[PDB]
């Protein structure tokens, strides 16, 4: 890998976009996402993000703030880059038939610890800290701006690449 990620004077274009938490079950899913520029949330996760992406059209960016369950930190930020693709061939049984995947462009890959963000609280999630969020929890715009500044400017000592 390279430091192709973590741009410096990164303007977010976050005047009209949306921001969502991703909780990855595994570090492997993070690696594969970075390698192949895709993500799959749960069925409801994909549908929630698909609807948010389509409602935005091209008016604003949809960012995803990633964190592996139990890590204590966020591990980076990607932008969602396609509608959700439900493929029409995978699956034999009816429940594991139409599984969704969508495109992401990874922007920041860096460990930002939660102690840097616990002060930011989500008014749309019972005023809990942004670090308490569950997968596909949406972050209100002004709180998102605060989280993106912290993530973009934090001088990190680790990243998921050490794995």
Curated annotation (Swiss-Prot):
Induction text = Following heat shock stress.
- State the oligomer form and interacting partners: Interacts with CNOT1; promoting recruitment of the CCR4-NOT complex. Interacts with YTHDF1. Interacts with YTHDF2. Interacts with PAN3.
> Taxonomically, which superkingdom?
Eukaryota
Location relative to the cell = Cytoplasm, Cytosol; Cytoplasm, P-body; Cytoplasm, Stress granule
Full protein stretch here: 400 to 562 of 585
Q: What name does UniProt use for this protein?
A: YTH domain-containing family protein 3
Which residues of this protein are annotated with the site description (Microbial infection) Cleavage? Answer: 139-140
| Family of this protein | Belongs to the YTHDF family. YTHDF3 subfamily.
Its UniProt domain note says:
The disordered regions have the ability to interact with each other and to 'phase separate' into liquid droplets within the cytosol following binding to mRNAs containing multiple m6A-modified residues. This leads to the partition of m6A-containing mRNAs into membraneless compartments, where mRNAs may be stored, degraded or used to transport mRNAs to dendritic arbors in neurons.
Q: Where in this chain does the record put each YTH domain?
A: 17-151
- Relate the protein's function as given in its record: Specifically recognizes and binds N6-methyladenosine (m6A)-containing RNAs, and regulates their stability. M6A is a modification present at internal sites of mRNAs and some non-coding RNAs and plays a role in mRNA stability and processing. Acts as a regulator of mRNA stability by promoting degradation of m6A-containing mRNAs via interaction with the CCR4-NOT complex or PAN3. The YTHDF paralogs (YTHDF1, YTHDF2 and YTHDF3) share m6A-containing mRNAs targets and act redundantly to mediate mRNA degradation and cellular differentiation. Has some antiviral activity against HIV-1 virus: incorporated into HIV-1 particles in a nucleocapsid-dependent manner and reduces viral infectivity in the next cycle of infection. May interfere with this early step of the viral life cycle by binding to N6-methyladenosine (m6A) modified sites on the HIV-1 RNA genome.
Where do the annotations place RNA binding? 23-25, 29, 39-40, 69, 93, 98
Q: Please outline how this chain is modified post-translation.
A: (Microbial infection) Proteolytically cleaved by HIV-1 protease when incorporated into HIV-1 particles in a nucleocapsid-dependent-manner. Cleavage by HIV-1 protease probably ensures optimal infectivity of the mature virion.
């Amino acid at each position: 890998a390279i430091n192709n990620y973590n741009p410096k004077d990164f303007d977010w274009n976050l005047k009209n976009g949306r921001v969502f938490i991703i909780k990855s079950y595994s570090e492997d899913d993070i690696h594969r996402s970075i390698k192949y520029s895709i993500w799959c949330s749960t069925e409801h996760g994909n549908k929630r993000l698909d609807a948010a992406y389509r409602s935005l059209n091209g008016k604003g960016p949809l960012y995803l703030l990633f964190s592996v369950n139990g890590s204590g930190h966020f591990c980076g930020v990607a932008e969602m880059k396609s509608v959700v693709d439900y493929n029409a061939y995978a699956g034999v049984w009816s429940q594991d038939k139409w599984k969704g995947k969508f495109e992401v462009k990874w922007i920041f890959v860096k460990d930002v610890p939660n102690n840097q963000l616990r002060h930011i609280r989500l008014e749309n999630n019972d005023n809990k800290p942004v670090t308490n969020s569950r997968d596909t929890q949406e972050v209100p715009l002004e709180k998102a701006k605060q989280v993106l500044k912290i993530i973009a400017t934090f001088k990190h000592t680790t990243s998921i690449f050490d794995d």
